Design an enzyme around this catalytic site. Structure first.
Site, PDB file in Angstrom:
ATOM      1  N   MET A 154     -11.416  -8.016   1.188  1.00 18.50           N
ATOM      2  CA  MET A 154     -12.725  -8.377   0.682  1.00 18.50           C
ATOM      3  C   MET A 154     -12.654  -8.572  -0.832  1.00 18.50           C
ATOM      4  SD  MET A 154     -16.486  -6.544   1.125  1.00 18.50           S
ATOM      5  CE  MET A 154     -16.129  -5.173   0.008  1.00 18.50           C
ATOM      6  N   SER A 155     -12.786  -7.487  -1.591  1.00 22.92           N
ATOM      7  CA  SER A 155     -12.763  -7.574  -3.050  1.00 22.92           C
ATOM      8  C   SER A 155     -11.457  -8.133  -3.608  1.00 22.92           C
ATOM      9  CB  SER A 155     -13.046  -6.201  -3.674  1.00 22.92           C
ATOM     10  OG  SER A 155     -11.937  -5.333  -3.526  1.00 22.92           O
ATOM     11  N   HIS A 174     -13.578   3.065  12.736  1.00 16.28           N
ATOM     12  CA  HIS A 174     -13.165   3.890  11.612  1.00 16.28           C
ATOM     13  C   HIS A 174     -12.414   5.153  12.010  1.00 16.28           C
ATOM     14  CE1 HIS A 174     -15.835   1.083   9.694  1.00 16.28           C
ATOM     15  NE2 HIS A 174     -16.776   1.435  10.553  1.00 16.28           N
ATOM     16  N   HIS A 226     -10.284   1.054   5.944  1.00 14.19           N
ATOM     17  CA  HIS A 226     -10.114   2.005   4.875  1.00 14.19           C
ATOM     18  C   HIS A 226      -8.856   2.780   5.165  1.00 14.19           C
ATOM     19  CE1 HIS A 226     -13.777   0.657   3.259  1.00 14.19           C
ATOM     20  NE2 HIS A 226     -14.064   1.744   2.564  1.00 14.19           N
ATOM     21  N   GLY A 255      -8.549  -1.634   0.933  1.00 18.64           N
ATOM     22  CA  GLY A 255      -7.589  -1.525  -0.153  1.00 18.64           C
ATOM     23  C   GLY A 255      -6.275  -2.243   0.066  1.00 18.64           C
TER      24      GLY A 255
END
Lengths: 193, 190
Positions: free
Chosen positions: B166-167, B102, B122, B146
């Site tokens: 993912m989403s 990260h 991210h 995103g």
């Protein structure tokens, strides 16, 4: 009769670590069962108790065979439906393997798959806990550790049933005085000895 | 550029298995990241996709190194704060190891610790960090966070070796169609 302490998957690692260090001399084994924590947090927990001087030989990792291997913990407790003892032993012969069983059938099969012992219960199963306890001890030759609602007042019955030891979770970890709680159990067991 | 689909840890194994089978041919890898499910449940999931005829070579197990090993899965994705790639390769040399990083510093350390690639996440300063990282380490960098078809160009131009979603796929009403938009865009830029 052995006394196994089972962590409760509800406290921050710092708090849990202190309790583990505090009760270590009153129990034979401590099972790390923080099912809701990440491996990272469990590794933090282990580091805290390792630095706190815990005797790794009393530690048992529930479910996370990987964490056990990378933490030098040679004892694992395998939940029902997870890894088979046979496949685990094939790769890691050194591991002492416990299997969590919930029926006479599962206990026997666990013995066949080369498990070292079974953690049977939630004795207190349709009320068949204590009877099954005896039935299992008569059918298999490996140790049977009883778990599920174990209290000092129920130890005699469990002992009479043939249990080789008891496992306690909330009875110790939910107590306002974990050390005194662990002692009521150990005292009761020594008494019956 | 590779396309990695990451499970969302929120659906029953039956439903999740179905989705995984459906999108397999639209992605390069599928990461099983059901952090809140038990080993028993994840093994049940794996049984379902295996019987559903999935290409096991595409499976990546996130976090559960033990499940991967006993499921004949050679790829693992290691969360930040978990096992180091060095410990893993010492015992299981055949595993392909990914590290979830990260920060730039964590990415560099991941390479030193012998990871095979990193999942930098991210991004959505994020793309700038990505670009910076792509000059600091020589192992592949998969960008996550995103990701959308409209943002893939900037991500690719910045050096990403692939993108993870993912989403954007699993939370979609039509996962296959969702995955197609990403794959179509990636082919387009190719």
């Amino acid at each position: 009769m052995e006394l196994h302490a089972i962590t409760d998957d509800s406290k921050p690692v710092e708090e849990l670590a202190r309790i583990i260090i505090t009760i270590q001399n009153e129990v034979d084994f401590i099972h790390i069962r923080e099912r809701s924590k990440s491996a990272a947090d469990i590794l933090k927990l282990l580091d805290l108790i390792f630095e706190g001087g815990i005797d790794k030989r009393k530690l048992v990792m529930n479910g996370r065979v990987d964490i056990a291997l990378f933490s030098t913990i040679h004892r694992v407790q395998l939940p029902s439906g997870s890894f088979s003892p046979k496949q685990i032993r094939a790769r890691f012969p050194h591991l002492h393997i416990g299997r969590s069983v919930h029926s006479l059938e599962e206990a026997v099969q666990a013995e066949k798959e080369d498990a070292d012992y079974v953690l049977f219960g939630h004795v207190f199963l349709e009320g068949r806990g204590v009877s099954l306890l005896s039935d299992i001890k008569q059918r298999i030759s490996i140790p049977v550790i009883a778990i599920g609602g174990m209290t000092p007042d129920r130890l005699r019955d469990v002992k009479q049933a043939g249990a080789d030891g008891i496992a306690v979770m909330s009875g110790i970890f939910s107590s306002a005085e974990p050390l005194e709680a662990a002692r009521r159990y150990s005292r009761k067991l020594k008494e019956m000895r």
